[PDB]
Design a protein around this ligand. Structure first.
Ligand SMILES: NC(=O)c1ccc[n+]([C@@H]2O[C@H](COP(=O)([O-])OP(=O)(O)OC[C@H]3O[C@@H](n4cnc5c(N)ncnc54)[C@H](OP(=O)(O)O)[C@@H]3O)[C@@H](O)[C@H]2O)c1
Ligand SMILES: Cc1cn([C@H]2C[C@H](O)[C@@H](COP(=O)(O)OP(=O)(O)Oc3ccccc3)O2)c(=O)[nH]c1=O
Ligand SMILES: [Cl-]
Ligand SMILES: [Cl-]
Ligand code: NA
Length: 316
């Protein structure tokens, strides 16, 4: 019996990534899709199946929904996640899970009281390429890790939560994935467009307590980049398309050390399918990994520490 999934919000990420995953995944059945405009829901249901629903409360009321996918804008996550959990639905929430750490802790407490799964949908964590990179780093391919950089920048597109919340979250999450649980804020700059009043870009510096640093760049006034890079005591490793590799795209790991470089081609994987599968498997089994929520909470704290500690610059 697949878990029956309802979607609140006919989002770009839903149309492009999450819904094709849900539709294909045997463990999940799209039963309803809701929108502020019925016609938009109906267009989504014509594409992916399920019943179109006007407005979000009506979807939360359905007996044929077991879990709700929430690809709303960041600032609206907390209200709708809170309501979906109170209606008894497990929830797959897009990143960033919510807008700060205290709010994230309130949402997990509500889920906890009900035995429900709340998962942050960082689908990139489900791509095997990062564990293959981390195993190479662990085998010493570039010696001891000294520093780390990651970047996710995209060209300006036609409100939103700003470049920090919707994009900078990725490189920040990669830093925690690779460098571990004790990352602390050191400094950052966020550039705010005075015109529309919105973060359009930034750069942050984090460090572990041993002094392994992370320089994270993000933004939406930029050419496409989507990469990370390790500097080690005897080498360096970098890779491109780290956050949004196609399903069919084969990663290429680049290593450089003294007088020798190598590139390794890895197998292609569907991280969108794999993330949806992990969510569905956790729901069906009742095994809700503790690491996922602890990682989301650490993540929310570092995102807060960056918003709060950043030098804010308004242009022009
Ligand atoms: N697109 C991406 O690949 C991408 C990239 C990075 C991060 N994200 C994250 O994914 C989530 C959604 O991002 P998105 O890029 O897919 O956004 P999006 O295309 O704007 O989708 C958000 C959906 O939320 C609904 N909504 C409800 N109230 C709204 C309001 N006041 N203003 C705008 N939309 C409202 C709309 O659905 P209805 O009109 O159907 O109600 C809208 O289609 C956010 O947490 C974001 O950080 C997405
Ligand atoms: C390949 C590529 C993409 N984009 C644009 C196209 C798109 O506007 C943006 C991101 O494309 P992608 O990394 O594929 O991410 P998803 O759309 O799956 O998820 C996000 C969408 C928006 C923000 C973050 C993630 O960059 C480019 O401009 N050039 C490129 O080579
Ligand atoms: Cl992701
Ligand atoms: Cl390449
Ligand atoms: Na600040």
């Amino acid at each position: 019996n697949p878990i029956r999934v309802g979607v609140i919000g006919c989002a770009d990420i839903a149309w492009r990534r999450a819904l094709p995953a849900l539709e294909a995944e045997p463990l999940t059945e799209v039963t309803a899709i809701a929108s502020r405009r019925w016609d938009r829901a109906k267009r989504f249901t014509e594409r992916f199946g399920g019943e179109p629903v006007e407005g979000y409360p009506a979807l939360l009321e359905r007996d044929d929904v077991d879990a709700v996918y929430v690809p709303l804008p960041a600032v609206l996550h907390a209200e709708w996640i809170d309501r979906a959990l109170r209606a008894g639905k497990h929830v797959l929430a897009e990143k960033p899970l919510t807008t700060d750490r205290p709010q994230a802790e309130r949402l997990f407490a509500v889920a906890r009281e009900r035995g429900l799964l709340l998962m942050e949908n960082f689908m990139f964590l489900h791509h095997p390429q990062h564990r293959q990179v981390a195993d190479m780093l662990d085998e010493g391919v570039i010696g001891e890790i000294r520093s780390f950089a990651a970047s996710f920048t995209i060209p300006p597109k036609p409100v939103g939560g700003g470049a920090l919340l919707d994009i900078g979250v990725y490189p920040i999450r990669a830093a925690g994935l690779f460098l571990g649980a004790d990352l602390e804020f050191v400094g950052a700059v966020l550039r705010h467009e005075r015109d529309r009043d919105v973060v359009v870009g930034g750069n942050a510096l984090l460090t572990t307590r041993q002094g392994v640093t992370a320089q994270l760049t993000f933004g939406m006034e930029h050419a496409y980049t989507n990469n990370y890079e390790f500097r080690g005591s005897t080498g360096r490793l970098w890779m491109n398309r780290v956050f949004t590799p196609p399903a069919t795209y084969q990663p290429v790991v680049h290593i450089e050390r003294q007088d020798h470089a190598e590139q390794f081609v890895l197998p292609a994987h569907d991280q969108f399918a794999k993330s949806i599968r992990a969510f569905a498997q956790a729901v069906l089994s009742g095994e809700h990994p503790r690491e996922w929520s602890e990682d989301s909470l650490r993540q929310a704290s570092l995102v807060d520490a960056v918003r709060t500690g950043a030098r804010d610059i308004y242009f022009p």
